[PDB]
Structure formats: C-alpha cells, structure tokens
C-alpha cells in the first residue's frame, strides 16, 4: 500500500519532471560513475570487423529531487522504479555498427532515500574493431569500445570510473577466444575542453589448435611436394600431372585463406605471403 503512495508522491508529473537533469549551486556537474561487466564474448566476425559481446553496465549518480523522509513511510530504504520515467544520463557506444545504440531492456532502477541511483541494464553490443592480422593465427586482437553521452558535453555531467579493470564475476569461458586483460581509461582532450569519454580495451587471444589442425597441416603437407617432382625420372612422363595438381591445390588454399582474412589492405597475412612465394617457386618448377 504505502509503496503505491510513495510512487505517486515521487512520480508526480506536476512536481517531478523528466526532461531536465538535476543540478544545484550554479550548475554543478553531476558525477556519473559507470563500470562495465563482460558476460561472454559471443563471437568475433573477423571478416566484417565486428565483435559481439554481452555487457552489464552499471551506472550510479546522485539525484536530489527524488529524496523522501524515510521515517514516515514505515522506514523503507530502497524502492524500485521504471527507467522510462525518471531521468537518466544517456551512455552509448560511438564505434558501434548496426545502427543499434541504446540498451535493450530498460530495467527497473533502485532508489535509496539519500537520493543515489544505482541502475544496470544488460545489453548486447556489436562494436567495430580493427584486425591486426599479421601473425595468423598466433596473434592478438586489440578491440576498442567507447562510452560517452551523445547528448551532453562536459558541462553538466562528468564520467568517473569505479574500478580500473572490468569485472568478470559472471564470465564463462568463451571457447575459441581467450581474454588477457581488460583495461579501462578515461580520455580527455584538452584542446576541445568539452570532449569526455571512457574507453575499454579488449586484448583477445585466439586458441590456435583449431585453425592449426584444419589449415596448417594440409598446407605444409601439400607444399612439401614442391622439391619432390624433380626426383621423378622424366622417362615415365608424369611430371606434368603432379606439378599442375600441386599448383592448383596451392591456388585453392590461397583463395581460401584470402576469403577467411578480412580484406584489410593495410597488411598482407604472413601465411598468404609464404604461400604466394612457394607458388612462384612451383611455377618456376613447372617451366
């Protein structure tokens, strides 16, 4: 019962407004503490440079017009509220692809009698990160993800990290990929004096055995046939079939390995480079 009267007292459209953000004493900044929590890295479509993650981002901020006297209301401490009605500092990716920006669920938020708000909606994010594919597959991937309020500059809000590292209490082993460290850092452009943002860096490592067994063994296996054709005697008349077949197989593997690598013309994969070299060698062999 008293919960309903509490909600009607707090959520009065005539008394409480949503479009204006709280501030006192000459437009003081409202500190917004956000920290990320990685659920499970679900996929890395390396061909499209898209990383799909499940994220729980927690956000805390102080708000003064929402307070109430806890003594009168049966000594209640915390109350649940909908997100669509109380104001909320927008925090969304920038390097996000797919058009999707905001969170998916719009959860309920916890409100204490002091006025602090602690809110965490879960979401799925599709970030865009460049693939430094040189040591395929024995490599590392450096994916960046940025948070920032697209609507407010550093004049009403100010983002502050809670902890230096992303939390992994609700993590599951991603299977193929294995994480190393999840650093986070607050950037600050002094030239703009308005630009703020939080950047989390994900350094990811690939467990190599799958690709190894699937591609490296057949590749070196068939390319061991390079210097093999010449020990064959010419009188039998069979060099042509073997050599042309080897060249064809190498072309096939080249096309495949070019299909799996993202078309990043910034650099050439090492495996592809070696395979092109041995292709030139085997055509010199055929001539």
């Amino acid at each position, epitope marked *: 019962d008293t919960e309903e009267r509490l909600v009607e007292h707090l959520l009065d459209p005539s008394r409480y407004n949503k479009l204006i953000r709280p501030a006192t004493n000459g437009s003081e900044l409202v500190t917004v503490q956000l920290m990320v929590s990685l659920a499970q890295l679900i996929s890395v479509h390396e061909r499209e440079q898209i990383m799909t993650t499940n994220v729980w981002l927690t956000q805390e901020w102080e708000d003064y017009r929402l307070t109430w006297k806890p003594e009168e209301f049966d000594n209640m401490k915390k109350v649940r509220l909908p997100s669509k009605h109380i104001w909320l500092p927008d925090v969304v990716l920038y390097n996000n692809a797919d058009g999707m920006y905001e969170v998916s669920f719009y959860s309920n938020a916890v409100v204490s009698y002091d006025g602090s708000i602690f809110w965490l909606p879960p979401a799925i994010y599709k970030s865009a990160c460049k693939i*430094e594919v*040189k040591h395929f597959p024995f490599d590392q991937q450096n994916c960046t993800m940025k948070f920032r309020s697209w609507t407010y500059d550093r004049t009403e809000i100010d983002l502050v990290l809670k*902890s*230096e*590292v*992303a*939390s*992994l*209490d609700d*993590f*599951t*082993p*991603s299977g193929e990929w*294995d*994480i*190393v*460290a*999840l*650093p986070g850092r607050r950037n600050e452009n002094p030239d703009d004096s308005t630009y703020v943002d939080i950047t989390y860096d994900f*350094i990811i490592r690939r467990k190599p055995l799958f690709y190894t067994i699937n591609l490296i063994i057949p590749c070196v296996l068939i390319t061991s046939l390079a210097i093999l054709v010449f020990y064959l005697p010419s009188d039998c008349g069979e060099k042509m079939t073997l050599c042309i077949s080897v060249l064809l197989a190498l072309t096939v593997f080249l096309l495949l390995i070019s299909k799996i690598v993202p078309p990043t013309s910034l650099d050439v994969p090492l495996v592809g480079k070696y395979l092109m070299f041995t292709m030139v060698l085997v055509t010199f062999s055929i001539v």
Partner: antibody
Amino acid sequence: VQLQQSGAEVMKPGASVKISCKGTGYTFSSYWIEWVKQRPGHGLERIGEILPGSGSTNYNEKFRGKATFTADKSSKTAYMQLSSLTSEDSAVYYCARYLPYYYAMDYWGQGTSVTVSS
Amino acid sequence: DVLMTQTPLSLPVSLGDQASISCRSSQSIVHSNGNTYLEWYLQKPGQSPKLLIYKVSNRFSGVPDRFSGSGSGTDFTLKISRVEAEDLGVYYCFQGSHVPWTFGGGTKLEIKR
C-alpha cells in the same frame, strides 16, 4: 588492497602441498595472479599465473606437470595443487597481482616458507 | 623462453657513487605495437620485492628521481645517480613481450669501502 597467504608447511617427500592466496580490496576476478618461486640460495623463477574469472592457465616450460592451479570466484582464493614433491623444491613461495601490457605488479604477498625433510 | 642475462653478478660501489647495470635479452623483446614492456624489481633481505621502473621509458609513481633507466631495442641499462643506504639489495629484470614471461638472473649490489 591487501594480500594473504597460508602459514608454514612441512611434509614428507613424495606427498602434495596446497597453499592458499587471499585477496581483497580490488576486483579479484578481473586480472591475472602470478606466483614467484625463490630458492633460499639464489634466483627468482616463476611457477605460473591464472585468471580467477576463467580457467585460462599457463605454465613455464620448466615446471610442466609439476604444479596445477585452481581458483574460486565466490571465495576470493587461489589454490595450487602440487605434484610429486622432491627435496630439491624446498624454498619460499610468493604471490602477486599482475596485468599484462599495462600497469602491473604494484603489490605482493608476505611470503610462504615451505620446508620438506624427513 | 627468452633467457635474460644480467651483468655483472656483483658490483660493489661506495656511497654516493654512480652505478650502471646492463640487462641483455636472448632475443628481441619489442612488441609489435612499438613499446617494450620491461620491469625492474628491488628486493631487500627479508622482505618482498619493490618496484622502481616499469615501461623503462617511464618511471613508477612513488620512487624518487635518483633512479633512471634506458636502452636500445635489445640492450637495457639501469642507472642509479647516488647510492644511499636504502638501495642495498638485489635487482631483477622482467620482460613482458612473449608468453610465458620470465625473470632475470639476479644482480647483487652492496656498498664498498
């Protein structure tokens, strides 16, 4: 932040010993924890590190099959199962926090002295 | 494993003197990003190791300025300006390029008279 370890331990050769590492004051399940082995004679060698979030482990090529780590997420504790023990491994063991490619190794443990003799 | 060699084994130097210690790697330990991740450690007798230099081109927050470190792509040198009574102990190297990580050999350092 603060680190805790187990007390002194003695055992007959050939058996197994499990030492504990307690951590508080930070996000325990967020970054690596590596241990350092120091023989009372000289040198510093590692034993391995684990990520208390996942089961991602690695070992130095000299101590393969000698130690097996284990981490717990609910209780902020890292364990290590020890293989067949010989009288050449009686030394002092450490624990420390670490994070690759960035700021790292700013705190330590207090030291765990393990001695093995008949 | 990238083995590490420290030189010398023991370098007795008196109070106020400048001392230089070299730390060489078996391979190149420069990461593809363009930054070499190496650590210097200080251990005192009967205590846990301390930190003085991380990311050699940088310095730790809490260590005085008398310490300095630099080096080329492979050869590394830790330098001290004025030796005090507190800097007694043994130094160590730690590389952060390849997996697994490794320490050095241990460089002994005491005073001389």
